[PDB]
Amino acid sequence: MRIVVTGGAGFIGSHLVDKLVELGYEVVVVDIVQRDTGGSAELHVRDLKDYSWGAGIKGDVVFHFAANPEVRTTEPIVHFNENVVATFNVLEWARQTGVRTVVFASSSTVYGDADVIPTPEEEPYKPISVYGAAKAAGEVMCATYARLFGVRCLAVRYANVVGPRLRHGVIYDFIMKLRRNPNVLEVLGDGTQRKSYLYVRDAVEATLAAWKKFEEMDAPFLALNVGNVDAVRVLDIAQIVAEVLGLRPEIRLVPSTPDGRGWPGDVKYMTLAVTKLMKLTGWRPTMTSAEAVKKTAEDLAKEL
Amino acid sequence: MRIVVTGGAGFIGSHLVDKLVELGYEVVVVDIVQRDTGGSAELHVRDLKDYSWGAGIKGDVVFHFAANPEVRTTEPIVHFNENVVATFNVLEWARQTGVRTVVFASSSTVYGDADVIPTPEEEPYKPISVYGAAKAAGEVMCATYARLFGVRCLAVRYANVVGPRLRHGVIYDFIMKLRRNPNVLEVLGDGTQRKSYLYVRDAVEATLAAWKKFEEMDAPFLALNVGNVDAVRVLDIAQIVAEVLGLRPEIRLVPSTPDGRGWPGDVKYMTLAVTKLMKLTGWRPTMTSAEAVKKTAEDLAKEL
Numbered sequence: 369m370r371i372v373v374t375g376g377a378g379f380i381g382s383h384l385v386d387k388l389v390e391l392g393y394e395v396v397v398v399d400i401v402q403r404d405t406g407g408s409a410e411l412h413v414r415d416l417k418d419y420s421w422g423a424g425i426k427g428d429v430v431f432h433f434a435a436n437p438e439v440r441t442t443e444p445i446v447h448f449n450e451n452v453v454a455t456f457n458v459l460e461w462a463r464q465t466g467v468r469t470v471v472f473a474s475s476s477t478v479y480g481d482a483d484v485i486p487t488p489e490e491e492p493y494k495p496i497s498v499y500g501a502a503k504a505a506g507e508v509m510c511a512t513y514a515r516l517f518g519v520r521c522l523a524v525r526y527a528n529v530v531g532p533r534l535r536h537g538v539i540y541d542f543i544m545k546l547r548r549n550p551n552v553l554e555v556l557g558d559g560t561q562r563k564s565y566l567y568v569r570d571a572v573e574a575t576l577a578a579w580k581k582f583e584e585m586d587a588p589f590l591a592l593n594v595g596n597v598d599a600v601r602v603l604d605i606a607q608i609v610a611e612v613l614g615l616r617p618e619i620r621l622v623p624s625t626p627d628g629r630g631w632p633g634d635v636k637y638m639t640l641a642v643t644k645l646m647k648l649t650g651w652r653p654t655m656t657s658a659e660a661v662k663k664t665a666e667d668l669a670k671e672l
Numbered sequence: 673m674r675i676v677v678t679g680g681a682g683f684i685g686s687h688l689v690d691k692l693v694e695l696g697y698e699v700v701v702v703d704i705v706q707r708d709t710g711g712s713a714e715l716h717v718r719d720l721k722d723y724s725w726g727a728g729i730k731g732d733v734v735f736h737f738a739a740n741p742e743v744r745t746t747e748p749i750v751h752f753n754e755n756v757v758a759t760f761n762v763l764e765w766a767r768q769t770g771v772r773t774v775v776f777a778s779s780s781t782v783y784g785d786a787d788v789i790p791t792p793e794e795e796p797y798k799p800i801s802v803y804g805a806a807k808a809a810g811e812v813m814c815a816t817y818a819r820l821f822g823v824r825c826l827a828v829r830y831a832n833v834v835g836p837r838l839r840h841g842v843i844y845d846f847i848m849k850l851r852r853n854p855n856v857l858e859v860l861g862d863g864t865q866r867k868s869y870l871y872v873r874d875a876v877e878a879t880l881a882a883w884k885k886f887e888e889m890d891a892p893f894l895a896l897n898v899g900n901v902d903a904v905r906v907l908d909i910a911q912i913v914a915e916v917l918g919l920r921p922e923i924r925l926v927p928s929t930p931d932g933r934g935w936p937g938d939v940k941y942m943t944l945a946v947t948k949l950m951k952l953t954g955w956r957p958t959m960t961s962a963e964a965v966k967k968t969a970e971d972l973a974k975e976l
């Protein structure tokens with residue numbers, strides 16, 4: 369069995385790659401950047417915005433993890449091509465080359481400001497960022513390809529995933545900020561925003577379990593939340609990171625939106641319900657939001 | 673107040689145009705084909721697949737009705753560009769040029785094989801065609817633009833709309849078939865498929881009412897079903913059309929899918945719930961599905 373991982377060189381994807389090699393799969397990495405970790409993995413540099421990206425590339429299953437992950441309105445076209453056109457180009461390659469299954473990296477942002485927290489998968493699409501819209505659009509398209517062409521689609525709605533090699537997000541930004549100036553930490557928003565953080569090891573294991581189980585179901589489409597069970601405030605994240613570095617910076621709140629978000633489209637409060645994932649797979653997290661945040665801070669502290 | 677109508681030269685759009693001129697609006701028509709009916713309407717030939725389509729075009733409200741309406745899998749990229757990229761290009765023009773409102777032509781296909789018939793707007797996206805996916809994707813994007821940029825979005829989910837100038841769909845196809853050969857009528861599917869048909873006059877009036885009322889609400893996004901209250905079987909449509917023409921053709925059923933659909937992705941049974949539309953606006957249909965079908969047959973019979 370051949371597994372293609374798009375975005376294989378990036379954060380979650382690379383972890384996915386390593387784990388798939390170990391378990392015995394013939395792994396194909398497709399990414400716009402090079403990563404030459406060793407291993408069995410057949411390497412391809414391609415741009416998924418190109419319809420013809422997958423020429424001469426063959427797999428039975430694709431993990432589609434190529435995207436631009438940054439939520440931060442100003443340049444929606446880049447989001448559009450990177451997140452919408454690229455996903456369509458993946459699904460067209462899957463259709464025409466006999467790929468059986470798509471595992472799609474989705475996101476908690478598909479829910480927007482959710483009406484129920486912890487958020488169940490039954491909650492409707494209400495995204496508030498162009499990135500959330502692009503993920504929801506991707507989900508709809510991959511589900512349709514499932515129903516119409518039999519390219520079954522597991523949409524995995526990730527909350528924040530944190531660990532070694534992460535190069536985006538609050539922990540990474542906070543660390544990079546204190547590196548430039550240790551005395552001041554600018555924090556976007558009103559400091560009160562609260563989100564779950566799942567350590568990468570836990571995320572990978574929930575993803576692979578859910579995939580295995582999806583394969584023994586026959587629903588054309590399944591959407592599954594993969595996140596932690598608790599949340600951490602941004603101010604608490606600021607302290608954890610500061611402590612790891614041995615620092616006590618001046619915390620400067622940056623006003624941005626009437627309602628205290630860090631930027632327009634920033635969801636302030638998020639925790640996903642992981643009942644379905646637990647039920648279906650027997651998966652549990654091995655860390656809390658706080659522990660995952662601290663461990664990642666330590667990881668990125670030594671890398672960066 | 674300036675109203676831009678994309679797809680202004682086509683079936684629903686042109687009717688929308690004429691009606692908007694009468695009521696006093698400064699109307700701007702944007703379409704890839706020319707239509708020179710007279711009137712106040714400022715005319716533009718543009719391709720909405722072009723990001724720069726709306727250069728020098730200004731409006732306070734857009735009715736976005738430019739699309740490829742054909743559901744009939746084989747060429748999804750054309751659907752993608754025509755229905756997804758074009759809608760994104762409209763929304764980007766609306767954002768950057770101070771447009772206040774989008775009226776988006778959506779479709780009953782966003783529901784797929786609906787679990788409840790008549791289908792309420794609360795029913796989730798389960799499209800079974802690439803066209804349905806593209807409409808659902810459009811809805812998600814325009815809703816997000818509403819929430820994020822204040823470009824409020826009325827998504828109008830049309831069931832079949834039928835009348836003068838219609839050049840696609842079953843009635844048009846049946847007529848064109850009997851014109852080529854009056855003795856044989858090929859009917860796709862198992863003949864049992866059942867759908868509502870709303871006469872164009874009724875559709876236009878429900879659209880303009882819902883728009884007026886949407887403007888006095890403050891929900892960023894509203895999705896509204898606009899359809900008839902009853903359905904007609906394809907075989908009954910075949911007879912109505914045949915009778916209008918004075919004909920009794922041999923009815924030949926064409927097998928296509930294990931489950932009797934005319935093609936993969938063809939929804940067999942559809943009727944939308946129009947409670948919300950009635951409640952909000954005091955709108956009623958003036959015809960039945962059967963009457964609208966017969967009247968359209970007569971209309972297209974004399975045009976074609």
Ligand SMILES: NC(=O)c1ccc[n+]([C@@H]2O[C@H](COP(=O)([O-])OP(=O)(O)OC[C@H]3O[C@@H](n4cnc5c(N)ncnc54)[C@H](O)[C@@H]3O)[C@@H](O)[C@H]2O)c1
Nearest residue numbers: 375377378379380399400415416434435473475526528529
């Ligand atoms: N990390 C999280 O917390 C999280 C949460 C929710 C969803 N996700 C989704 O997980 C997936 C990856 O997340 P990540 O954090 O690893 O980000 P990342 O940036 O580390 O990984 C993405 C990889 O995609 C590649 N890529 C981008 N555009 C490409 C293109 N056009 N063609 C080929 N390759 C391209 C990038 O080079 C990168 O290596 C994305 O879909 C992301 O939106 C991540």
Ligand SMILES: NC(=O)c1ccc[n+]([C@@H]2O[C@H](COP(=O)([O-])OP(=O)(O)OC[C@H]3O[C@@H](n4cnc5c(N)ncnc54)[C@H](O)[C@@H]3O)[C@@H](O)[C@H]2O)c1
Nearest residue numbers: 679681682683684703704719720738739777779830832833
């Ligand atoms: N007619 C119905 O029963 C019905 C039902 C549900 C939804 N809708 C939606 O209503 C809208 C119009 O339906 P219709 O039946 O009038 O179809 P139509 O083909 O008569 O009208 C569409 C118009 O869009 C124009 N167009 C297409 N691509 C374009 C582009 N790239 N740039 C500029 N113009 C372009 C076409 O030239 C045409 O004049 C579409 O969004 C359709 O999907 C119609």
Ligand SMILES: O=c1ccn([C@@H]2O[C@H](COP(=O)(O)OP(=O)(O)O[C@H]3O[C@H](CO)[C@H](O)[C@H](O)[C@H]3O)[C@@H](O)[C@H]2O)c(=O)[nH]1
Nearest residue numbers: 437438475476527528538541555556557561563602630634
């Ligand atoms: O430099 C920063 C960066 C972020 N924040 C704030 O702290 C919170 C950070 O929350 P997240 O950890 O969720 O970071 P993002 O909002 O950037 O992450 C979002 O995008 C991710 C991918 O980048 C995932 O999709 C994830 O599901 C989604 O929450 C936000 O409310 C933000 O306002 C700051 O104050 N300063």
Ligand SMILES: O=c1ccn([C@@H]2O[C@H](COP(=O)(O)OP(=O)(O)O[C@H]3O[C@H](CO)[C@H](O)[C@H](O)[C@H]3O)[C@@H](O)[C@H]2O)c(=O)[nH]1
Nearest residue numbers: 741742779780831832842845859860861865867906934938
């Ligand atoms: O030549 C034909 C054409 C259609 N049919 C059958 O009769 C039914 C026709 O139903 P519709 O009137 O709904 O026609 P479409 O399925 O082509 O229309 C669909 O696409 C439309 C735009 O083209 C609208 O979006 C509408 O909501 C959606 O039902 C279908 O089940 C189809 O299988 C035939 O037998 N022969």
